[PDB]
Amino acid sequence: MYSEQGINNTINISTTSLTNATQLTVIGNNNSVYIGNNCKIVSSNIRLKGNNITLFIADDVEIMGLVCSLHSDCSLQIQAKTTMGNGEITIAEKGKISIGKDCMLAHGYEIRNTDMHPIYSLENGERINHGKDVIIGNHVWLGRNVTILKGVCIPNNVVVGSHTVLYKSFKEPNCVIAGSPAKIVKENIVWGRKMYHSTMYDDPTLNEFYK
């Protein structure tokens, strides 16, 4: 459920979705929220402060303790079957963040498309750190306390090591990324949710990654 103030906000949250202990605050005009079926979005605080903002959460998404701040003309899209523990998402500068299907974001994530303040080059006075969209691909696992900064695109089927800060995009899927700066530390892997399988062949969710 939610607290909505302004003109022509559209909030459509499926009746099959649970929103226990969550604060959804929409302050402004022409904002739109869609939450799909069989979601569990609990103990969160989602704030849309501005105009023309979009939040889209697909089916079967489970979120616990997300603190999310969206400003005018920004967009957050989270695709189906993604799960997220406690963390923070911040979108400004009329930008966007997208998180793919069947991602797994462990406690302590911080994801942002913006530094929130300008840096200028002394060579010409011009701003050099404009906001840039973040794209997290399908089936990405962010370990604990991962930080994803502006402009970063993460390929499909990637694991990001605990405590890693990503400043730059990667192109290689099926790898583990860790260190500073962040780099590929292992290639040719696939991760899964349940650790009771002899091999990957026992997890029917993984077939697409190896077939």
Place this chain on the structure above:
Amino acid sequence: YSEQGINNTINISTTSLTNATQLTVIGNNNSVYIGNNCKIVSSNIRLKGNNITLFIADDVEIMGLVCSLHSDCSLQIQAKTTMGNGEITIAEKGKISIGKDCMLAHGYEIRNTDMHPIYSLENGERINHGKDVIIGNHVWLGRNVTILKGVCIPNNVVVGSHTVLYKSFKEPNCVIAGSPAKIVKENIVWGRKMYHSTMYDDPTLNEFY
């Protein structure tokens, strides 16, 4: 504290304090042991499964620990150890042991497991099995230190603020820091009290020299 199951044994001696702490035990044939003169406050401790062993020796002070133990796991914290806020997770039937007279600053994360599997595409095998963590006697973890699976810390070691350990170390009496974690100083001993000018003023340090 909250118990659902049979043949669970819980001995929390008095002389020891558990103010504002939640203990939940779901399962059977589990054992919780907290020694004398311990301080276990504002913590949330969960045991779920069977034949789990939680052992906290005498003279232990823990404030704000979140601890999760799964079936057939064991956590052992030896005497004199002090701990601030942090997290310990044990799974995959493994164990974590923390030696005597350790000093763990706020922010610690200790676990023997990733909680999820990573397989090789090359042979389909899981490659990140859980492994025991052994933290030696008289270890100081600075703020926000992360100790991951399979790591063994020698006796009398300082780990620098915000360091993450992925690998074991063999050298005692050292300071460890950086990324990757590295020995950055050798032949030291730490103590708890700044007012002790020299290691000779601190009777607790006799054994390390």
Place this chain on the structure above:
Amino acid sequence: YSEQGINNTINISTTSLTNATQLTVIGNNNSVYIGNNCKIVSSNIRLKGNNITLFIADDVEIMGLVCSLHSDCSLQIQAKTTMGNGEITIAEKGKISIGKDCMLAHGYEIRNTDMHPIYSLENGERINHGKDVIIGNHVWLGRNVTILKGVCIPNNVVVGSHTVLYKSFKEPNCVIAGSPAKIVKENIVWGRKMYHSTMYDDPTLNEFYK
């Protein structure tokens, strides 16, 4: 506030807000000054000992600071500096200073002390004595930055998110980030307002270029 001891002085301007902030001073000869138009809110500030100094100039905004000062220590924060949630600890009779118009994001941990001694086996002597921290003018600390003892930060520097500083830098007008912390960008100046087109549009930045 709560104050115990003799010759303790506490001057908090009438024009400053201290909502939800607890201030505790225990000892003798301690001095607290908070200047005009400050907002020092939801903070926990403790002075315990003798001859301690807390100086916070005009137009400083602080939210969620946990600050601990021991005997003969001093903390000085100059005008127009803003600080989110964080921790500052000063012991061993040392000093921390934060210059004018700094911007510290939530999560800072700043200390001049390790709080616990490390001794050399060779001679039994303590070898991690506390050292003073100096953060220059117009320093921006990104989220969750840690500044350890002895560190001096030059004027007009940005420190990147989750960076740990364990040693001093001398280059101004740069961005420092990574582990180990290093200069990753030179010849810059940061400002507060994303709405501005260029550095020239922000009159507070005039003193840093030309």
